Amino acid sequence: GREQWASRLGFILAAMGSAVGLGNIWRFSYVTGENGGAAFLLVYLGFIALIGIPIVLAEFTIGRRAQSDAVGSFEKLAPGKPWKVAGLMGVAAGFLILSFYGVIAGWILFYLFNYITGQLWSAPAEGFGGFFEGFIANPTLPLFWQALFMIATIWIVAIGVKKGIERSNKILMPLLGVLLIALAIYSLTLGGAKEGLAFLFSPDWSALKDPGVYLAAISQAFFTLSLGMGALITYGSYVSKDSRLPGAAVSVAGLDTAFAIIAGIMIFPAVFALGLSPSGGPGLVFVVLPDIFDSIRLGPIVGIAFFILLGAAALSSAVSLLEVPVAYFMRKFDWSRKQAAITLGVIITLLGIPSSLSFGVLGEVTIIPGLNIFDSVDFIASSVFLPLGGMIIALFIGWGWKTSDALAESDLTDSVWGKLWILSLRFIAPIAILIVFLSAF
Numbered sequence: 001g002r003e004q005w006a007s008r009l010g011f012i013l014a015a016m017g018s019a020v021g022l023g024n025i026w027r028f029s030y031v032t033g034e035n036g037g038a039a040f041l042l043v044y045l046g047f048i049a050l051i052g053i054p055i056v057l058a059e060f061t062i063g064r065r066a067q068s069d070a071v072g073s074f075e076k077l078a079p080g081k082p083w084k085v086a087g088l089m090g091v092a093a094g095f096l097i098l099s100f101y102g103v104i105a106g107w108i109l110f111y112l113f114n115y116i117t118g119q120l121w122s123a124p125a126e127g128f129g130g131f132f133e134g135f136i137a138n139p140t141l142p143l144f145w146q147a148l149f150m151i152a153t154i155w156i157v158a159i160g161v162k163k164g165i166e167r168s169n170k171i172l173m174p175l176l177g178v179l180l181i182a183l184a185i186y187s188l189t190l191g192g193a194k195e196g197l198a199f200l201f202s203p204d205w206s207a208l209k210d211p212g213v214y215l216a217a218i219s220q221a222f223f224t225l226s227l228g229m230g231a232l233i234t235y236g237s238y239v240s241k242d243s244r245l246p247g248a249a250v251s252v253a254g255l256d257t258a259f260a261i262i263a264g265i266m267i268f269p270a271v272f273a274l275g276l277s278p279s280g281g282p283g284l285v286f287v288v289l290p291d292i293f294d295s296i297r298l299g300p301i302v303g304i305a306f307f308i309l310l311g312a313a314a315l316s317s318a319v320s321l322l323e324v325p326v327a328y329f330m331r332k333f334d335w336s337r338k339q340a341a342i343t344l345g346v347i348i349t350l351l352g353i354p355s356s357l358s359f360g361v362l363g364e365v366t367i368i369p370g371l372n373i374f375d376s377v378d379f380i381a382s383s384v385f386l387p388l389g390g391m392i393i394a395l396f397i398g399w400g401w402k403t404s405d406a407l408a409e410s411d412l413t414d415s416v417w418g419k420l421w422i423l424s425l426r427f428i429a430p431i432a433i434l435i436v437f438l439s440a441f
């Protein structure tokens, strides 16, 4: 008795709701800032076109054909073949990513609370920077808001696909977009527009000499597209043949890129106007945006609206993150949805506590040489499991399927686009991920 999307637009809006989240604003900004900007952006955009869209369609095709979880899709379509490692890696990536994703979303709820209680209407005495560092260094305060955000995530996933995940408000994502556009226009009028736009669109190829820039670009591309972990396999597994998968993949990647680019047009001209370093780090948007809201007269209102709509997008993205282990645990151990959502959601919440403490008392600890627990967990998930999982997924359709089956199940003919998509999965995307891997070591 597997669930299905009740409405016709349920699938595409859920995929869009999974893609558009904290990766478009919070992560895109601080990764672009510390990687040089425009040159990193063009590689990132190229990764979205030639690798992201094909592998997104790949995950859709696997999910709808198999009607199973991320791991079960490989067992059903290729029994006893080693392709199921991608789903296994993807389930574990759901644990690691959601562990720290709920921490950052806990920052969102905390800032929303401070605007609703009138705390951040004016600049605190310690400054918008010192206020942010004092809150993340506090050992217990972020955990309370992290747990609060996880309770919402657990609640939606436990309610179900039809009654929970699908029942997301269809105005919040367009309202987030309209506000980002309105905010991007305003930051262009703050004085740092020339150097901010040059940093974002005028590329310096000297940064591309580093192989690590390519690894950050492929990681952000996979991360922002909810790609390489079976998250799109799971949402595709609730779709009937009613849908057209090609247009869904292009619309998902096209909308996700628009959110990211406009976020950069909002953030970076504001960074230069404030004279701050764009390589500030994970708290970049949390220091820049409240300082931009403070310059507006109706600033507190924009801040309340911004963090509500951003938290709403973070909620729908964390739901798809939790859905991957929930669906896998329901099939494998015959767990109910409620027990899988509660038990796995509690475990993931505790897993993220050490990464939350990395910003404070555990700042000295390393796991991956030179990286704290937060950066170590983000690195193995975003830079290792997602690109490798996406590489295996591309090779699965490219070399483990019949060509006619790959095109027919993906709603494509043997046309120029059908051949371009098969070429990407067989060669272009896997070799690109492979070359990015090898050069980074």
Ligand SMILES: CCCCCCCCCCCCO[C@@H]1O[C@H](CO)[C@@H](O[C@H]2O[C@H](CO)[C@@H](O)[C@H](O)[C@H]2O)[C@H](O)[C@H]1O
Residues within 6 Å of the ligand: 109, 112, 113, 114, 131, 134, 135, 138, 141
């Ligand atoms: C959006 C959903 C809202 C539902 C939740 C509503 C109930 C919220 C309960 C209030 C919890 C507030 O808890 C209290 O917060 C304030 C800051 O806000 C902290 O007060 C102080 O502590 C920390 C550092 O110690 C500082 O970052 C902060 O600037 C300072 O004001 C208290 O140390 C904390 O105990």
Ligand SMILES: CCCCCCCCS[C@@H]1O[C@H](CO)[C@@H](O)[C@H](O)[C@H]1O
Residues within 6 Å of the ligand: 182, 183, 185, 186, 189, 190, 191
């Ligand atoms: C629908 C969204 C439209 C948003 C437009 C916001 C532009 C704000 S103008 C404002 O005028 C001042 C001088 O008059 C300058 O000093 C400021 O730098 C500048 O910010």
Ligand SMILES: CCCCCCCCS[C@@H]1O[C@H](CO)[C@@H](O)[C@H](O)[C@H]1O
Residues within 6 Å of the ligand: 194, 197, 198, 201, 202, 203, 265
């Ligand atoms: C939504 C607003 C979009 C604005 C896009 C601006 C892209 C041009 S940036 C950069 O600015 C410098 C100005 O001198 C030049 O040196 C560079 O050649 C040029 O590339």
Ligand SMILES: N[C@@H](Cc1ccccc1)C(=O)O
Residues within 6 Å of the ligand: 018, 019, 020, 021, 022, 023, 024, 097, 222, 223, 224, 225, 226, 227, 229, 231, 317, 318, 320, 321
């Ligand atoms: N795409 C989400 C992050 C995500 C990754 C993997 C699965 C689901 C969601 C974002 O950009 O916020």
Ligand code: NA
Residues within 6 Å of the ligand: 018, 019, 020, 021, 022, 023, 024, 223, 224, 225, 226, 256
């Ligand atoms: Na995204």
Ligand code: NA
Residues within 6 Å of the ligand: 016, 017, 018, 019, 020, 021, 312, 313, 314, 315, 316, 317, 318
């Ligand atoms: Na979202």
